């Protein structure tokens, strides 16, 4: 009789207390002797006493049901992803058997109840995705068995409390995405000897990283990113025996990357990007088999250590926006499944490493604003994995490998401001995903291949400052997704055709400084989105078409051609004075033309 | 950067059925490789080209942060709501083309601060209220179309507006003055 309970009645009171529009609690029937087969209800004894209630994602709305604490054997409660609102009550401590409490992704507001620390059995507390505000209660320092504390994405506006360092059982401290009063990392956090995760992203952290943090031998993840931390990366961090991931990105950190980081055998991910770090990337760190190394947007200098090529698990290296000098590792990509390489805005020189895509997983090759020299490795012609190629603002030369033109998943190919020679291969027809082709300021020669018109989804063709020649392929006029066509500073010849009408999405047409001949097609007026037209420095002949006045153009240059006849009254104005200069047969009502 | 963030803010408030803004990746260092965005040699945005893209939704004040923008092309779309006053903070703007949209509300007085503006086309919208006298202080203005709107009041005829013909102000609700038929009370 002492082992009798009213658990079904108590659960019915919970049901009555909460709005259930979608009828998730339909299976809760007051006629049932026991609630043990009800949805979200578990009686793990078989003695008919409720041990677990999981009401996750049930669209339940209302305040926290304090009556549930009258379930004497309740050890697990999840109200995750519901509309639970109002303040979390201080009488939650009545739930004295609770080991796990998940009230995450709710509308709970107000100050955290200090009585949460008065549940001795509590091991897991998750209040993520709530509107909790004010100071973390001092009671939280006195948690008896808590291993997990998560207050992520709340409105907590207090300082980060040192007393949280006094929870000896703590494995995870998750305080990320909180509008905390700007505060330092307490040195007492180094007393959390069993801590595996320290997640303090966007916690308005100020001051220096305490040396004490080096004593956290069991730490797997250290995330101090998106804060205003100042000072050096502590050499004490070499003490983090089990650390796998370290995130210090977007702080105000200064000083050199400690060589002691090489002592971290388990380190796989390091991001110290968007800081003010000085000096050279240490060889000892590069010896560690890293999976991701991001040190971009720092003031780092010197050579990239060749040891980084040794890692068999490297997929991400982003070290752009530094003053790094010398050449890339020769064996980079040979032994690693490299996916993302960004060495842009550096002083790197020498040939590109030959086997960057050896493992066949390279998606992004970004090397812009460097002094890289020589030819594109022929191996990259078989790198079908590539999606983004940016080799611009380098000292490259020679013919592009034939295959490189026809890589199937490449969205952007950018070879601008190099000395690349040769022709675009007919292989360009294979570039199914190509949207942006930028080949400007090179030494490219030859006719544009007819297969360029096979690229139905091509949005931008920019081939300025080249030695391209010949009549435009008839296929080029079939590109109806083309927004920008810039062929200025070339030796293109022949006539434009009626097919230009199919350029319905063309915003900019620039054919300036070429050898184009014939009349401007009357179909120029059919181009609805054309606002920029430059046909200057050609041998275009005949009368300017009347259809041109239909267009709303912000830029027009027809200067230095052989155009004849009269400037229509619409185009005879002071805003078009520099648009029709250098056409001897042309005369209009402009003061200087004739 | 800031310019990329501002353009991304516009993307989230615009409705984009044909995914024309698919390339607008905020993780990029700058938006210069974004399709429909043209940058200068210093990698600052000088053109946004989003005409006839079936875009709906509203504009954002964040467009004002594009200090070097010269051409804003948002014409032939279904953009609704007010023309942002912060467009007046676009100091280097040469073309403002918001024509063939469902823009409501007043023509902002701030647009007068666009000293270098040469093209203003707000035609085929539902804009209401008076034409600001600030617009006459734009010495560079060479093209103006406020036609097919619901504007009212006196049409300015001084400064830049001296050369402007009736086709610029046609089919408005109750515009008065010399360029129009009805003179002003």
């Amino acid at each position: 009789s002492s082992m009798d309970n009213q658990d079904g009645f108590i659960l019915q009171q919970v049901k009555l207390s909460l709005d259930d529009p979608d009828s998730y609690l339909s299976s809760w029937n007051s006629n049932d002797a026991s609630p043990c087969r009800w949805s979200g209800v578990s009686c793990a004894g078989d003695f008919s006493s409720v041990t677990s209630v999981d009401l996750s994602s049930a669209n339940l709305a209302g305040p926290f049901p304090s009556v549930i604490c009258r379930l004497s054997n309740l050890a697990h409660l999840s109200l995750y992803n519901n509309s639970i609102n109002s303040t979390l009550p201080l009488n939650i401590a009545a739930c004295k058997s609770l080991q796990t409490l998940d009230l995450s992704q709710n509308l709970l507001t107000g100050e955290l109840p200090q009585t949460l620390a008065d549940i001795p059995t509590l091991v897991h507390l998750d209040l993520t995705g709530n509107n909790f505000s004010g100071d973390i209660p001092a009671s939280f320092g006195k948690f008896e068995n808590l291993e997990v504390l998560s207050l992520v994405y709340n409105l907590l506006d207090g300082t980060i409390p040192p007393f949280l360092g006094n929870i000896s059982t703590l494995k995870m401290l998750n305080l990320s995405y909180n509008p905390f009063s700007p505060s330092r990392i307490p040195p007492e956090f180094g007393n959390l000897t069993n801590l595996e995760v320290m997640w303090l992203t966007e916690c308005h952290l100020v001051g220096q990283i305490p040396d004490s943090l080096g004593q956290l031998s069991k730490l797997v993840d250290l995330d101090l990113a998106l804060n205003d931390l100042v000072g050096h990366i502590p050499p004490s961090l070499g003490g983090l025996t089990n650390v796998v991931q370290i995130e210090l990105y977007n702080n105000s950190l200064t000083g050199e990357i400690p060589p002691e980081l090489g002592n971290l055998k388990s380190l796989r991910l390091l991001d110290a990007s968007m800081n003010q770090l000085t000096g050279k990337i240490p060889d000892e760190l590069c010896r560690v088999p890293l999976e991701s190394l991001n040190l971009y947007e720092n003031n780092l200098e010197g050579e990239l250590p060749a040891s980084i090529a040794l890692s068999p698990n490297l997929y991400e290296i982003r070290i752009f926006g530094n003053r790094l000098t010398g050449g890339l590792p020769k064996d980079l990509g040979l032994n690693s499944p490299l996916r993302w390489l960004d060495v842009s805005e550096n002083e790197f020189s020498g040939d590109l490493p030959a086997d960057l895509c050896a493992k066949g997983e390279l998606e992004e090759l970004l090397i812009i604003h460097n002094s890289f020299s020589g030819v594109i490795p022929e191996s990259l012609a078989d790198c079908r994995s590539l999606t983004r190629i940016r080799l611009a603002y380098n000292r490259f030369s020679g013919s592009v490998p034939t295959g490189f033109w026809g890589l199937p998943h490449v969205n952007l190919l950018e070879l601008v401001n190099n000395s690349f020679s040769g022709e675009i291969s007919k292989s360009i027809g294979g570039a199914s995903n190509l949207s942006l082709l930028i080949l400007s300021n090179n030494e490219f020669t030859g006719s544009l291949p007819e297969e360029i018109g096979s690229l139905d989804n091509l949005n931008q063709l920019s081939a300025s400052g080249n030695k391209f020649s010949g009549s435009l392929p008839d296929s080029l006029m079939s590109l109806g997704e083309l927004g920008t066509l810039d062929l200025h500073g070339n030796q293109f010849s022949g006539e434009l055709t009626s097919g230009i009408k199919s350029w319905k999405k063309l915003n900019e047409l620039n054919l300036a400084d070429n050898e184009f001949t014939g009349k401007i097609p009357d179909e120029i007026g059919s181009l609805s989105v054309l606002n920029y037209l430059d046909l200057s420095g050609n041998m275009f002949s005949g009368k300017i078409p009347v259809s041109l006045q239909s267009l709303k153009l912000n830029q027009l240059n027809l200067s230095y051609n052989r155009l004849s006849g009269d400037l229509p009254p619409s185009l005879a104005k002071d805003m078009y004075k520099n648009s029709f200069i250098g056409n001897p047969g042309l005369c209009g009502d402009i003061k200087g033309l004739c | 950067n800031l310019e990329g963030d501002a353009l991304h803010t516009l993307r989230v408030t615009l409705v984009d059925p044909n995914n024309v803004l698919q390339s607008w990746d905020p993780t990029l260092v700058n938006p210069c490789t974004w399709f429909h965005v043209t940058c200068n040699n210093e990698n600052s945005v000088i053109r946004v080209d989003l005409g006839n893209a079936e875009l709906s939704g509203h504009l954002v004040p964040e467009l004002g942060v594009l200090k070097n923008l010269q051409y804003l092309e948002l014409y032939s779309n279904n953009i609704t709501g007010p023309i942002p006053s912060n467009l007046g903070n676009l100091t280097n703007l040469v073309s403002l083309d918001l024509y063939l949209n469902s823009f409501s509300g007043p023509i902002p007085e701030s647009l007068g601060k666009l000293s270098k503006l040469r093209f203003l086309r707000l035609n085929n919208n539902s804009l209401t209220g008076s034409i600001p006298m600030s617009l006459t202080n734009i010495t560079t203005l060479q093209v103006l179309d406020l036609s097919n709107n619901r504007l009212s009041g006196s049409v300015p005829d001084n400064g830049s507006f001296s050369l402007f013909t009736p086709i610029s102000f046609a089919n408005n609700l109750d515009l008065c003055g010399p360029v129009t038929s009805h003179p002003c009370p």
């Binding site: 993840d221 960004d342 842009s344 | 993780t27």
Partner: peptide, 14 residues
Amino acid sequence: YVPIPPSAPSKRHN
């Protein structure tokens, strides 16, 4: 439901 940025490397690239 507010989605939560995971603890992971930053994603900025050219």
